Design a binder for these strands. Structure first.
Ligand SMILES: [Mg+2]
Ligand SMILES: [Zn+2]
Ligand SMILES: [Zn+2]
Ligand SMILES: [Zn+2]
Lengths: 552, 271, 112, 178, 107, 171, 87, 97
RNA sequence: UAAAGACCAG
DNA sequence: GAAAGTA
DNA sequence: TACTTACGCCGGTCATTA
């Protein structure tokens, strides 16, 4: 994992502290500027321009380069870069909150609309629960639409007390696509679009004690931060390309949408530095907000799916995490794994309850890393000589010096003098405990540990009474097997989830495996008063019982 | 959903059943602290029958010629008849058994007497018997104290919780209430002698197991009962090959788990 | 009384079917739907909208808004949840992990 | 690295490390209030040379002792000899640091007797000055109160010139000869 | 305790949290025609002295948030006139163990 | 200056060393890893004290591999230098740029320009020297310096010092 | 804090070793013997670490301690020795 | 093959803690990133070789750790960052309890 | 190598 | 397409 | 009072593509 030693102390994660990125941090953390929307070709020459993807960020090419760091492809995680947007833009995700936060603070001055002076407010301001509190404070302030100058104190309602003041009626705000529009009113309304710059600023003035009251955080996430200024550029590892040989493209979906954001950006800025036909610059600003909004969420209410020339909608980052098949649920709550095998199953009335016949073909593939101990040097050496193609054998030797000898090529396979502390990846052998399972897996019992029994033919062979638990027939069902890779993992399998252990189930305080089909229908007959057995047979019937005290 | 909803629930090292916040969902797992796989459907005799039959069974009157332990059953037969001090304990017993009978009829209003409880006491005795080759012919050698005091003493060992404070201790007595009614139900002086001719040895044995067995039945701190229950409910919902007319089955459970308002069938029964 | 019915009810859906479930499973369910105060549902609306940590919650129904609403109100996930550790790739505090294992140096000499 | 007895919760804003100067503003990991191995306030432990010559020596010895319980089953120029031996029998040998420190320490110690070195301590200790000073005063040969107050600025308004002048006198006496 | 017949004015019910410490409750006659606590399904609750409670929390190493909660407007919660913080001890018959201890704190 | 600081290390032991005399192997590892170490946070670690009672505590068995992780609590004698600390040591090197004085495990450097002017460099002498109307400074000469600043470098600490103020210089 | 280490007596958990504690001790112990750790029993024939592990546990010669956490963070320590191994 | 959600729930049911971590890590993802002890970020410019670590921006080179998390998560994190969200990862706890 | 789709297994 | 929670 | 929003059960082969 990660490979190559690191003097760094290794600990586990104990807390995940969520928060929002302050623009000043992004700049700090960044390792590349990122000005050019192109990807590479130092004038068609294949490399990477100091412009987009790797102006010192991650890498490509199994080319150790990477701003000293080196290490190469696997090992170097990503290195972020930045991109100084030309104008403040919302963050699709927080449009809802920005809206509601404004409705809570008066513009122009930037202060709550209900001090401790107001009663009902006090109640809310007491509510310990960042989220439920902001929830309330809003219901009260949305309604208030004037930044009162003086409120009748908690005494006589005739004399009015002083607080902050600036009458400025507060515009009922509303949503239009990605814009917040408000309609003031004094004496018909006065409609005007609240600008980002404008709202960003009000926020920058919201009192530290006022964030907080409105579920925020002085260190980790102040409202003003829901407005992107400097944009973090994820490194190659996040949006890898695809290199079909030499003379061929391969840029990821995300790499295109950044180029778009970068393009749409250069556009704007160059306009505010030139013939700035004002109310035409804003035409170009809405664009920037469209991409920076789209690059994140691209399944918004005001439809315009932002399609890639080819009709395809362009995978928004959000898209990447949305459940099932998506990052969280598809890559973490569950994932494809190594040391696994699957194949058609078939019953076998000659395997003990807790075994599982495993096709040799499969046993010669799945391995187990046993460590060279004096307790087994001999055996292991035998398996190694034995090679990777005979059965009772092995297919990899790993010396302390992290490097694996491939027994099917290493010019010294027939050789090799093991070494205590070395590791031999050997074949699955009879009795290795393994996890056997049939899907859908809705039982602890749909996954049980079994003893391996390597056998001929290509099917997983399993004892009938263990049928029900998995709920399998032999009309073509397949079943998968997982081989534990560590000494304690097997112990966990054998000691906790072995089939024998799972016989009487909590599911309903009774056994979940009994006798079935042949044996059942047949055990009845064998029993009937009528049924008598004569010596010649009785003698065999007795011998079959593996325990029999040998006492006719 | 059932799963994702209970993932994080497990029995902690204190027997409490909490989620990933330490919020208590059940003070003692399943209201008894017992592991499901260690429970069988036994029958609490005491519950049913006529008050008449109940008496003919558990009552022992050393002060009445016709209602004493015949000296055949016991070895200290004749010398116990009329013992006022023994008939004090022997009463205490019967007055408890009756208490129970009331309490059970309280709990299981129905009268239903077959409920799953740890330690199958019947088998434990069955073994006791043809393990010692007990003949329903000879007289036991149990003191009336032996029986009464042993059973009374055993219960002191059926530990589910182990706090050395009053709150916990009460909790303990609670969690064991029903098991005990079962225990006293089957280890009543009359029975232990007239029914199963247990001998002092056998008895000392039965008692010993009931204990061990019990202790083994308590749930293990670790048991992810969350998922277990999720799957235990969830699984049989998959096997649902779907006044009588009332929402039911899958569509109904979907109703319930959703705590939906308007339900297809919203009846109500008035007695 | 609610909890009493909620169970009677769940119990009857599994009863009609003619199957059996040890009381404890239905109970643990019913009690969960109940502790908080009322009738939290096994729904993106009920249970998954509690104090349990972001990462947990985000692994069902509303994945991304949950993660956004998280960095915005700067929550802190302490990781006592299975899901937290699964996502982090660490041994969760489950069965084999509900406790720790120490080498007692003293007893390591008593033996020899 | 080696974690030290103080856990200041570094929440993001990691920036404020002041100037380290004899304004007695030393690292955070060197304040007056320290926290003991068993979790108890303990005042900073500052050593003047020689006193630290003994400390090291003592332990270096006591160590050589236990080093053999397990093997069961005077004169400046002369000590740089006797010590260089103890080292090569209880040290990693590559500890050029400890070797150098031991020579420096031996060659510049102002008190060679655990008795004299205790007097010095008792003496100074009655001042109430900060450990840093009480150490400097102990390891820096100063005549006028000025020479002292000048090389140990931290002092200046803490003790009168006469007072500090007395102490400086008492020190020149205890000042073990050689 | 003020028992009204059909209803009071939002004007009137708005002068209750006005005489602290003393507190005021308000029941509608219809709501009392039947005592719900006499119901087949309603388990006997019990208020706990702020001592009985502080103990409970000690003997289970709980904070208040870790306790099952009962709603302030909860029928029985009203019956006993609970208060935000007051803990109730519910005792119900169990088909698993006969008797079961259960605590609920107030909202 | 020189202090006695209560520190703490963390050693991960392989299962192989789960011997009868393990504590002894740990203590020895500690010593290898601390004595002679150097940080900016603690300065120069010189000598681990009170050997016989180095607290070992119970180790945690790491889950995937079988190693045990120990949090060894010790107490040692350290040497962290500071600005304004007046310290005297012996000269070691000496060039046309100034001389390097050795104080303890450390080395303080004096810039020709942080010495009085009267004191000039002398190349034609051996060993190379710096002379003054009355003083003469070279390799062997003891000097009392005033540390102007430090610079923590990997496994060490350096500083620059002057002897231009009063009461500093040769002794 | 270690104001959290519940003193030996006053311990209130279970006298018996849970299934996981044992599954986990046998595994850990195997994992260490499997790593050439020193064994504390006569491996009378034995050559498989889990086997050896089980034997150690049997003669209560496993130098390990189970640290049991209570939902509040406080914890009780138990020796593989003290622990009753009914299971 | 896929050790999916439901298979995961089963190991959880069994209480097979380690075996679960084995499937998810050793037998699939598992990567080793370097964290900064101050900001819980994956910024550390570690060059395991010249032993240099650094974290300009937090300016470090000292308080630094390494961790073993599933690469899929290293991704999840760098992605929550691209969306301007900070999933700071910390080696010790504070909140207590 | 990566998508989106159709068909199909239990 | 159905059902449940905000402007 | 009507409008807005999340979601959906758990391996294999072939065809086509801005
Ligand atoms: Mg089938
Ligand atoms: Zn790099
Ligand atoms: Zn204003
Ligand atoms: Zn950093």
């Amino acid at each position: 994992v990660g490979q190559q030693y690191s003097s760094a102390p290794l600990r586990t994660v104990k807390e995940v502290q969520f928060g929002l990125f302050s623009p000043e941090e992004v700049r700090a953390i960044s390792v590349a500027k990122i000005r050019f929307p192109e990807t590479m070709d130092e004038t068609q020459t294949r490399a990477k321009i100091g412009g987009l993807n790797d102006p010192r960020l991650g890498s490509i090419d199994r080319n150790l380069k990477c701003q000293t760091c080196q290490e190469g492809m696997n090992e170097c995680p990503g290195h972020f870069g930045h991109i100084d947007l030309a104008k403040p833009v919302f963050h699709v995700g927080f449009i809802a909150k920005i809206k509601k936060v404004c409705e809570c603070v008066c513009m122009h001055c930037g202060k709550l609309l209900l001090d401790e002076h107001n009663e009902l407010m006090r109640q809310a301001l007491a509510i310990k629960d960042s989220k439920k509190r902001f929830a309330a404070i809003w219901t009260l302030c949305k309604t208030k639409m004037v930044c009162e100058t003086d409120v009748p104190s908690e005494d006589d309602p005739t004399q009015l007390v002083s607080r902050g003041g600036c009458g400025n009626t507060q515009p009922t705000i509303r949503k239009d696509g990605l814009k917040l529009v408000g309609s003031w009113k004094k004496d018909e309304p006065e409609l005007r679009v609240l600008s980002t710059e404008e709202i960003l600023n009000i926020f920058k003035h919201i009192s530290v004690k006022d964030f907080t009251s409105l579920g925020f955080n002085e260190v980790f996430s102040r409202p003003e931060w829901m407005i992107l200024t400097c944009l973090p550029v994820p490194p190659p590892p996040v949006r890898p390309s695809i290199s079909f040989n030499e003379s061929q493209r391969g840029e990821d979906d995300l790499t295109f949408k950044l180029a778009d954001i970068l393009k749409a950006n250069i556009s704007l800025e160059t306009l505010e530095h030139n013939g700035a036909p004002h109310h035409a610059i804003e035409e170009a600003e809405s664009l920037l907000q469209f991409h920076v909004a789209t690059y994140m969420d691209n399944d918004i209410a005001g439809q315009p799916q932002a399609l890639q020339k080819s009709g395809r909608p362009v995978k928004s980052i959000r898209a990447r995490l949305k459940g099932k098949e998506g990052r969280i649920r598809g890559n973490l709550m569950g994932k494809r794994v190594d040391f696994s095998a699957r194949t058609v199953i078939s019953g076998d009335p000659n395997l003990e309850l807790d075994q599982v016949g495993v096709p040799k073909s499969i046993a010669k593939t799945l391995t187990y890393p046993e460590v060279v101990t004096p307790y087994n040097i001999d055996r292991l050496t035998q398996l190694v000589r034995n090679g990777p193609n005979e059965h009772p054998g092995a297919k990899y030797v790993i010396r302390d010096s992290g490097d694996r000898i491939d027994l099917r090529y290493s010019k010294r396979a027939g050789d090799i003098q093991l070494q205590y502390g070395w590791k031999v990846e050997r074949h699955i052998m009879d009795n290795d405990p393994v996890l056997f399972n049939r899907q859908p897996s809705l039982h602890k019992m749909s996954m049980m540990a079994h003893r391996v029994k390597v056998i001929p033919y290509s099917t997983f062979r399993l004892n009938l009474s263990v049928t029900s638990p998995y709920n399998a027939d032999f009309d073509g069902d397949e079943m998968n097997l997982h081989v534990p890779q560590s000494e304690e993992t097997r112990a966990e399998l054998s000691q906790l989830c072995a089939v024998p252990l799972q016989i009487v189930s909590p599911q309903s305080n009774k056994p979940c495996m009994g006798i079935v089909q042949d044996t059942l229908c047949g055990i009845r007959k064998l029993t009937l008063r009528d049924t008598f057995i004569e010596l010649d047979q009785v003698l065999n019937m007795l011998y079959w019982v593996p325990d029999w005290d040998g006492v006719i | 959903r059932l799963v994702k909803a209970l993932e994080d629930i497990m029995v902690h090292y204190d027997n409490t059943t909490r989620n990933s916040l330490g919020n208590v969902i059940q003070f003692i797992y399943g209201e008894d602290g017992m592991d499901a796989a260690h429970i069988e459907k036994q029958s609490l005799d005491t519950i049913g029958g006529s008050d008449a039959a109940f008496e003919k069974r558990y009552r022992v009157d050393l002060l009445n010629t016709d209602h004493t332990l015949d000296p055949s059953l016991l070895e200290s037969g004749s010398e116990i008849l009329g013992d006022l001090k023994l008939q004090v304990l022997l009463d205490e017993e019967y007055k408890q058994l009756v208490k129970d009978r009331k309490f059970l009829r309280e709990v299981f209003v129905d009268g239903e007497a077959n409920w799953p409880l740890p330690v199958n006491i019947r088998r434990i005795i069955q073994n006791a018997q043809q393990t010692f080759h007990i003949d329903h012919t000879k007289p036991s050698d149990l003191t009336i104290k032996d029986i009464v005091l042993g059973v009374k003493d055993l219960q002191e060992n059926l530990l589910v919780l182990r706090g050395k404070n009053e709150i916990i201790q009460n909790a303990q007595r609670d969690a064991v209430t029903l098991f005990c009614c079962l225990l006293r139900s089957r280890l009543a002086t009359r029975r232990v002698l007239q029914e199963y001719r247990l001998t002092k040895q056998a008895f000392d044995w039965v008692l010993s197991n009931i204990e061990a067995q019990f202790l083994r039945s308590v749930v293990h701190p670790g048991e992810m009962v969350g998922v277990l229950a999720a799957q235990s409910i969830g699984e049989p919902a998959t096997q649902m090959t779907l006044s009588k007319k009332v929402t039911s089955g899958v569509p109904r459970l979907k109703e319930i788990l959703n705590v939906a308002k308007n339900m297809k069938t919203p009846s109500l029964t008035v007695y | 009384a609610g909890r009493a019915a909620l169970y009677k009810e769940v119990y009857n859906v599994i009863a009609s079917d003619g199957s059996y479930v040890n009381y404890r499973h239905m109970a643990l369910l019913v009690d969960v739907m109940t502790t908080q105060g009322g009738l939290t549902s096994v729904t993106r609306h009920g249970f998954n909208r509690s104090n349990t940590g972001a990462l947990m919650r985000c692994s069902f129904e509303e994945t991304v808004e949950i993660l956004f609403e998280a960095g915005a109100s700067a929550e802190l996930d302490d990781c006592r949840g299975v899901s937290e550790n699964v996502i982090l790739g660490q041994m969760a505090p489950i069965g084999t992990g509900a406790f720790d294992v120490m080498i007692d140096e003293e007893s390591l000499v008593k033996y020899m | 690295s080696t974690s030290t007895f103080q856990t200041r919760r570094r929440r993001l804003k990691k920036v404020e490390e002041e100037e380290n100067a004899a304004t007695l503003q030393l690292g955070q990991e060197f304040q007056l209030k320290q926290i003991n191995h068993q979790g108890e306030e303990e005042e900073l432990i500052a050593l003047n040379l020689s006193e630290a010559r003994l400390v090291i020596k003592e332990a270096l010895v006591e160590r050589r002792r236990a080093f053999k319980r397990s093997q069961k089953k005077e004169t400046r120029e002369k000590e740089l000899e006797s010590i260089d031996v103890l080292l090569e029998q209880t040290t990693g040998g590559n500890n050029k640091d400890l070797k150098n420190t031991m020579q420096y320490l031996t060659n510049f110690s102002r008190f060679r007797d655990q008795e004299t070195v205790g007097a010095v301590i008792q003496l100074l200790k009655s001042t109430g000055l900060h450990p840093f000073e009480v150490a400097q005063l102990g390891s820096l040969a100063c005549d006028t109160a000025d020479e002292a107050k000048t090389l140990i600025p931290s002092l200046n308004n803490k003790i009168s010139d006469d007072e500090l002048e007395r102490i400086l006198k008492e020190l020149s006496n205890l000042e073990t000869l050689y | 305790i003020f028992v009204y017949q059909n209803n009071i004015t939002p004007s009137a019910m708005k002068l209750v949290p006005s005489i602290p410490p003393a507190t005021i409750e308000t029941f509608n006659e219809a709501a009392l025609v039947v005592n719900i606590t006499h119901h087949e399904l309603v388990p006997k609750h019990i208020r706990l002295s702020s001592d009985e409670k502080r103990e409970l929390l000690k003997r289970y190493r709980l904070k208040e948030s870790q306790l099952p909660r009962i709603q302030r407007a909860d029928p029985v919660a009203l019956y006993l006139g609970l208060k935000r913080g007051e803990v109730v001890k519910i005792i119900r018959k169990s088909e698993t163990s006969g008797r079961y201890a259960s605590y609920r704190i107030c909202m | 200056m020189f202090f006695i600081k209560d520190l703490s290390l963390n050693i991960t032991l392989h299962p192989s060393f789960f011997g009868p005399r393990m504590k002894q192997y740990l203590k020895t590892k500690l010593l290898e890893e601390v004595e002679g170490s150097c940080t900016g946070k603690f300065g120069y670690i010189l000598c681990v004290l009170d050997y016989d009672n180095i607290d070992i505590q119970r180790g945690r068995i790491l889950p995937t591999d079988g190693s045990a992780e120990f949090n060894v609590k010790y107490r040692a004698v350290v040497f962290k230098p500071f600005k304004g600390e007046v310290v005297d040591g012996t000269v070691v090197s000496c060039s046309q740029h100034g001389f390097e004085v050795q104080v303890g495990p450390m080395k303080v450097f004096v810039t020709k320009h942080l010495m009085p002017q009267d004191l000039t460099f002398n190349a034609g002498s051996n060993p190379p020297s710096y002379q003054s109307s009355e003083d003469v400074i070279t390799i062997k000469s003891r000097i009392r310096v005033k540390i102007e600043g430090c610079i923590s470098q990997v496994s060490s600490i350096h500083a620059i010092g002057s002897i231009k103020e009063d009461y500093l210089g040769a002794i | 804090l270690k104001e959290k280490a519940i003193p030996k007596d006053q311990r209130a958990t279970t006298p018996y070793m849970t299934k996981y504690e044992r599954a986990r001790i046998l595994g850990t112990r195997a994992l260490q013997i499997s790593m050439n750790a020193p064994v504390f029993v006569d491996l009378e024939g034995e050559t498989d670490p889990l086997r050896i592990a089980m034997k150690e546990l049997a003669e209560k010669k496993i130098p390990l301690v189970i640290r049991r956490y209570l939902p509040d963070g406080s914890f009780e320590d138990w020796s593989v020795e003290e622990l009753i191994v009914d299971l | 093959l896929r050790f999916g959600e439901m298979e995961r729930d089963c190991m959880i049911a069994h209480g097979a803690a380690s075996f679960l971590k084995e499937r998810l890590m050793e037998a699939s993802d598992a990567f080793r990133v370097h964290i900064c002890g101050i900001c819980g970020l994956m910024t550390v410019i570690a060059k395991l070789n010249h032993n240099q670590f650094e974290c300009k921006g937090c300016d470090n080179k000292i308080d630094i750790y390494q961790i073993h998390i599933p690469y899929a998560a290293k991704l999840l994190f760098q992605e929550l960052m691209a969306m301007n969200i900070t999933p700071r990862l910390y080696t010790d706890r504070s909140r207590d309890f």
